[PDB]
Design a protein around this ligand. Sequence first.
Ligand SMILES: *Cc1c(COP(=O)(O)O)cnc(C)c1O
Ligand SMILES: *Cc1c(COP(=O)(O)O)cnc(C)c1O
Ligand SMILES: CC(C)C[C@H](N)C(=O)O
Lengths: 391, 391
Amino acid sequence: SWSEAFGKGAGRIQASTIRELLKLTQRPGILSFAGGLPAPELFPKEEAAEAAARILREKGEVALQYSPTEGYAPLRAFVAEWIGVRPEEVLITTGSQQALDLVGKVFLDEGSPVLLEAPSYMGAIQAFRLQGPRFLTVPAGEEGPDLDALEEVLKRERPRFLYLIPSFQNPTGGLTPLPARKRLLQMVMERGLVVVEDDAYRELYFGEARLPSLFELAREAGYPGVIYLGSFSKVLSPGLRVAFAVAHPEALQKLVQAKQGADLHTPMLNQMLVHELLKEGFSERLERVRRVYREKAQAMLHALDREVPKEVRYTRPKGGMFVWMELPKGLSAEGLFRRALEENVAFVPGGPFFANGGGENTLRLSYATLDREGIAEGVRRLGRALKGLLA
Amino acid sequence: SWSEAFGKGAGRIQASTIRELLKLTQRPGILSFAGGLPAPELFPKEEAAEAAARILREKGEVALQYSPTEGYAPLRAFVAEWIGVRPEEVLITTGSQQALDLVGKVFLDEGSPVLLEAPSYMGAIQAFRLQGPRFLTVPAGEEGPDLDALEEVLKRERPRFLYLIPSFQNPTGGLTPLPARKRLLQMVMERGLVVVEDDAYRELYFGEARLPSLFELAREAGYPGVIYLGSFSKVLSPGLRVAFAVAHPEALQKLVQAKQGADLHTPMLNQMLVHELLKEGFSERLERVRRVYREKAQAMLHALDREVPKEVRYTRPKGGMFVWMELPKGLSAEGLFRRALEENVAFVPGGPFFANGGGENTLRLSYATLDREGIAEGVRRLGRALKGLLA
Ligand SMILES: *Cc1c(COP(=O)(O)O)cnc(C)c1O
Ligand SMILES: *Cc1c(COP(=O)(O)O)cnc(C)c1O
Ligand SMILES: CC(C)C[C@H](N)C(=O)O
């Protein structure tokens, strides 16, 4: 009765990896390497308590009332200055996840081609699948998408957009280097193609500098086709659900009109709260997150080097939150997942990151949430798990 | 280029009368009867401020973290207890706007028939339009939907659901009476149809009691086909963006799953804040809400009775936030809108509340936001614009 009452969209949302992952802060028996849950030590609880009370006492009539679809104006200006655009070109979203939904709505139809990497971000796959697209993929490795494979796709297909995460890809941790960013921009400019650039990990670089985004390079070239997404989730607070999109006025208007119908506007308190927290001392805060994830990455890498047999490969990220692991072809990461849970350690099997399937032997390890010894203890429990499997 | 890069969904979100609405910060010499903005005098800023700081100090690690798609457990339980269902039958949404978006994705396809009133809630029309459905309408009256017209439509057509607002409809303020609710249910159960019941103004009744919802009647009868949408927007704070959907598990699970891809989850602070504010003294708060709006409605109606020429017709609501006004056929509400801007007063012309168009001589007035003396002044201005139009 219900199964016959649903429309086509109902058959396009079957995957439950996001919501199952979301139920990961147990109570609290789980050494979790699953879910890129930011370092809770980084949460400025006291500052947020202070700022939220003050907003509500002094600006409660704005904080509590319906508000414009585009965002809290001082947040839009803050973001405009940080990114290097005007406020009119910024839309505040209810996380970057909403932004992915909105891009799916404005650009995809049933059977529409969309290009993304294999593997790529699960939330993006989930948001886009809703529209019934044809997923076109290109492999993703340590240094970004395979551009020779892209070249071949582009001779045959015109994707509605390319979805890319040049800086520390979810789930691989891949970093697209500058000359590859440049070639990518050329290929896209030559064909007049649309890029969706998800920069959630922008500030989480372990090197001496971040690379220019595809958005910045496009902007220096005078190319209007890059839609740039950013978030305060990995930098401040996921729970607040505050992010942004930056786009050419025409693309932006479509996104604004779609967001209107999505949730009217992003909760105002949350935006005003993000602003209050960040408007002073943002750089210093950023330098600290950077310090913290570098350390957690180093702890996991050293623990893996000590605990993990050389028959299994894993990446060594230059930023972000993830180590991506590959078992020998023929071992299953879900199998591995069962055993890991029987040691009270969780990770994400790789399957869900692959839009068209495959990737059975792969898995994503997140070092974001646990401190050093929790990382060291989890990896040891994972070492015991993998060794029992390869034996 | 951009208009060539867009998909079909971009053609379907063209509408934008919520944005220019939500931009009504219009400073400050316009008296606006546009937009159902809850009375700011009702905002509990000080309780809100204290609750928020306490949440962020005591529970910041949860409030600021990624969180389950289903919602804050104690908010679900509070809702479940209020509405008379089980917690796991409650989905928390980022406004009732999100619930509508989600309902559209799971139920509607291109060329899908949906049925709603003419006129009806324009946020519903916007959310549903996105899917490219065929809108079937039924006239809305002071006693709700014309059930004779609904009977005729149902012979010819099987709508994927009926979207209705039985208690104080947006925009008419119509109240579907009990005998008409019982008949609507019979017509639906006979045919195994899905009802989406939007109950935003549930608690804003001006009489001695509220009428049972379609949802409560269905439940009494054992019929699983009503999806019930509630919101804290009209009783507490629209800005926080917290609302809920209640539905049969198969329906609800599809809603949770669509939500995963929409925003991951509703902000936890906001859900925690609403629950803290309501866990005690909710009935008493609702009684103050009711008194305030009864007062403002009576202020509105007396001013209209005093200032309005008898050739123009208007409703006398039994609750909610709106008066629906009809000009002599031949006259134009958009013209009045222009003239009313010369007399420094605003409202929402009726046109966009009509899915397939019509209602050019109709308009909606909101007594919700202005104080009683603002109401009397705004109406006297309206009365001057109207008598210029009538001469
Ligand atoms: C975390 C993430 C986002 C989604 O984050 P939000 O919390 O919705 O802002 C977007 N893209 C990538 C690649 C991410 O991993
Ligand atoms: C105000 C209103 C809503 C509530 O919208 P939210 O998204 O919860 O703020 C929903 N339906 C109708 C008919 C309304 O008038
Ligand atoms: C919803 C969560 C599972 C998503 C999170 N950003 C991650 O990739 O780990």
